[PDB]
Symmetry: C2
Subunit: 105 residues, 2 copies
Amino acid sequence: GSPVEFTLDVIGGKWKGILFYHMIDGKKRFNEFRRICPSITQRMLTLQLRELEADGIVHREVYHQVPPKVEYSLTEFGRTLEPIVLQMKEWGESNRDVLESYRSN
Amino acid sequence: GSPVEFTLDVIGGKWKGILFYHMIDGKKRFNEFRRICPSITQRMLTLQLRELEADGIVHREVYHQVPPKVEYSLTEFGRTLEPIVLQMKEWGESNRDVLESYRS
């Protein structure tokens, strides 16, 4: 399989990039992510986070009180994708206007 | 709108990264892509290349002879995605093993 597509399968799709980006500056609770993406449904957020966890990119820390505290963070392995994610942010910011021109016809 | 998800709209999905990557080293004909990517169907190849062209990433040059030659290439703009695409290639090669070990 293509290594480019292999990477995009880990970080691609509609939500993982956003989720990832917001963990760059530290751990987040589930409700913080819902405020970051008001159109994500709670089942879809849980699924996207489970897949990032399953791939070793995100750590899910559960505190054993009631109701339990749950915190999502980047693993060290996760952080190796940070340069690529930051480049996407920058390229997307820089090029939004010109992508819109090309699309405008 | 997340600028990260903006970029992924352009270069994302199952094929665009592969096709992009294969224009880095020069223009390609349609059948050249099919040989490179045997799993891709002719319909999917056509759509993906049309999406890339609509987005200003790929240039499609038609030579009006019979049968016409068509050549696909990266635009100046398109090549600005190279660091992202190549770095993803490098990450995927480097981290393939660790990632598959997490997936089992």
